[PDB]
Amino acid sequence: QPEPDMITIFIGTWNMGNAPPPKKITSWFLSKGQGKTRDDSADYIPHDIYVIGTQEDPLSEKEWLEILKHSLQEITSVTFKTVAIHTLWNIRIVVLAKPEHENRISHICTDNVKTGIANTLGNKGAVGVSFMFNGTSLGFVNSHLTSGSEKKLRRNQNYMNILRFLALGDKKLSPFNITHRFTHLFWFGDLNYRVDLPTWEAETIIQKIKQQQYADLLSHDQLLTERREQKVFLHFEEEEITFAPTYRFERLTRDKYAYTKQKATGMKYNLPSWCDRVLWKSYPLVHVVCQSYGSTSDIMTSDHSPVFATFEAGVTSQFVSKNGPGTVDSQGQIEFLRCYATLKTKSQTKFYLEFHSSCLESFVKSQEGENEEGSEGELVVKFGETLPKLKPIISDPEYLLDQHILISIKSSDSDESYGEGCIALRLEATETQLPIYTPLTHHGELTGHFQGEIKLQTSQ
Ligand SMILES: CC(=O)N1CCN(CCCc2ccccc2)CC1
Ligand SMILES: CC(=O)N1CCN(CCCc2ccccc2)CC1
């Protein structure tokens, strides 16, 4: 039985509004309703992995697992296996996989982060799951961020706290946050960003939604505008939104948006908004294609509608050669030529690099670079031709060209990372000097760039 080179992944996010679900929720897992929907001809085809994020979830883990599994079994006639379940307060993530994947999945991790302090600590935060699927690392984050139209900055701060402090994936990748630890990272939830238009415009917004004219609403969506100004979710992608705002509905219908201020809302307006979102970040030149992104129309127990997204995701095999794992393969090498980092820092320590990759027996530390001043004020750290030759465990190009090198630039004085990035080995040529580039981030914010050339030797 061959190992797959692609899998499909279902992502669901639903703020359940503290109410039990209705008896049938299959439309969610079938990607039916509004937006980019899944073809009817696929309805019986199971996804490989289902990842369900809930917020304001009133159910026990047992109660929700029984609903989810019985739902999938009705759709597919497959009994899914539970990979992981993790709950923080009323924020929950469930990962289910087809039984054939049980032996392909390993290194299962769970974590949570509580956001805010005192007043603002007690119900918002995130849960996450990571695991390996054969040679591919997968991360999943369900976050419930701060509510309210005038708190976009708090939401951005919640995002940074979550990506700093959520402890998933390989702990040996110590300089790297979750935004670098995974081949594919999916981040979803009730992110709570709003359509920023005046309150007086509520009925106009409702009109536009009834006409399915979302353009003048999406141009005021705080998540898209904050992302465009590089305030949040730097280097993540989102599919185009082609479904109506998923919040705030009157329960038991979808015919009415309940936006007016009430004692129960803290006297806040809830203009119709895309609170419920799915974003992703995959390593460079790895296959990832969004095949659905939408909302259900027939699940009405909550003041939010469920959101679905599905993905094709490239995966790689566990690789064994006569040499690695357990030794190097002398027919392989990775050379960095003429490399330099450009950093935004005002500091003047020396810097060194660390190269981390599962194609190496362990991470590699460079010598210190040579600091120069850039023409527009910047620090440039030159490595020239000084960088250590990297010795991969396997030389076979079918393995090596699918790998990635994580880079951290660290202060000699503090050993703290000033910037992290990622280089794909999916090159146009081997034994050929080719340009490389990554932006560098720290705590998910842009701190610099790394560029140079690479020369990759494989056994072919
Ligand atoms: C954190 C958590 O909720 N756990 C319960 C389920 N466990 C996984 C059960 C075995 C398995 C199933 C499917 C793929 C691989 C392995 C792991 C621990
Ligand atoms: C080379 C490439 O294909 N890409 C890199 C740049 N990306 C730009 C996304 C622009 C945008 C729109 C709205 C909010 C934030 C950002 C798109 C993907």
Side-chain angles (χ1 to χ4, degrees), residues 81-86 97 101-103 105-106 108 110:
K81 298 287 196 190
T82 306
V83 175
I85 180 163
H86 190 67
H101 296 328
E102 179 182 352
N103 297 289
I105 290 171
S106 72
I108 301 160
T110 63

Side-chain angles (χ1 to χ4, degrees), residues 223-230 232-233 235-237:
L223 183 50
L224 285 168
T225 61
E226 290 296 270
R227 275 183 65 220
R228 200 174 276 282
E229 291 181 38
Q230 292 181 34
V232 77
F233 278 104
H235 306 141
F236 281 73
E237 308 299 332

Side-chain angles (χ1 to χ4, degrees), residues 252-431:
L252 307 183
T253 178
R254 298 291 80 158
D255 296 344
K256 188 186 281 146
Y257 286 96
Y259 65 83
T260 201
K261 65 179 192 183
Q262 287 278 269
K263 287 189 263 176
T265 69
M267 305 301 296
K268 290 167 210 313
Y269 288 94
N270 288 296
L271 295 181
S273 293
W274 288 278
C275 287
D276 306 299
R277 305 294 273 265
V278 178
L279 297 93
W280 74 92
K281 180 182 183 185
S282 301
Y283 285 170
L285 297 179
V286 181
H287 180 87
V288 54
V289 180
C290 182
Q291 295 283 39
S292 70
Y293 189 38
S295 65
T296 63
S297 306
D298 62 342
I299 298 171
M300 297 171 299
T301 52
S302 181
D303 53 359
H304 298 241
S305 285
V307 165
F308 46 82
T310 61
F311 299 86
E312 307 181 328
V315 291
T316 61
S317 72
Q318 305 180 39
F319 211 102
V320 174
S321 76
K322 68 191 184 198
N323 298 309
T327 189
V328 296
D329 186 336
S330 51
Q331 301 154 96
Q333 51 177 87
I334 315 168
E335 298 181 285
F336 296 88
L337 284 89
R338 289 177 62 179
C339 287
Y340 59 98
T342 303
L343 298 183
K344 303 182 183 288
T345 194
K346 290 162 208 186
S347 109
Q348 258 297 356
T349 178
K350 291 190 192 154
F351 292 94
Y352 64 91
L353 299 182
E354 291 182 359
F355 301 92
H356 292 68
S357 181
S358 54
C359 76
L360 306 172
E361 285 202 295
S362 68
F363 79 81
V364 176
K365 277 156 134 70
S366 79
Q367 291 186 283
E368 296 177 319
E370 291 203 329
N371 295 354
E372 318 173 18
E373 166 95 50
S375 78
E376 269 175 291
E378 330 92 273
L379 180 63
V380 173
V381 184
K382 190 164 165 185
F383 294 97
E385 321 290 304
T386 60
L387 295 169
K389 179 189 311 192
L390 308 176
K391 292 314 184 83
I393 57 162
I394 290 164
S395 60
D396 185 333
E398 297 246 49
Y399 169 80
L400 197 48
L401 287 161
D402 280 350
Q403 305 305 309
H404 293 81
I405 310 297
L406 293 175
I407 297 182
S408 170
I409 184 161
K410 286 176 137 189
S411 156
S412 293
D413 295 346
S414 67
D415 294 308
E416 60 189 325
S417 184
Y418 278 55
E420 302 99 55
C422 181
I423 300 301
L425 299 188
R426 187 162 282 173
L427 311 188
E428 291 293 349
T430 63
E431 303 178 312

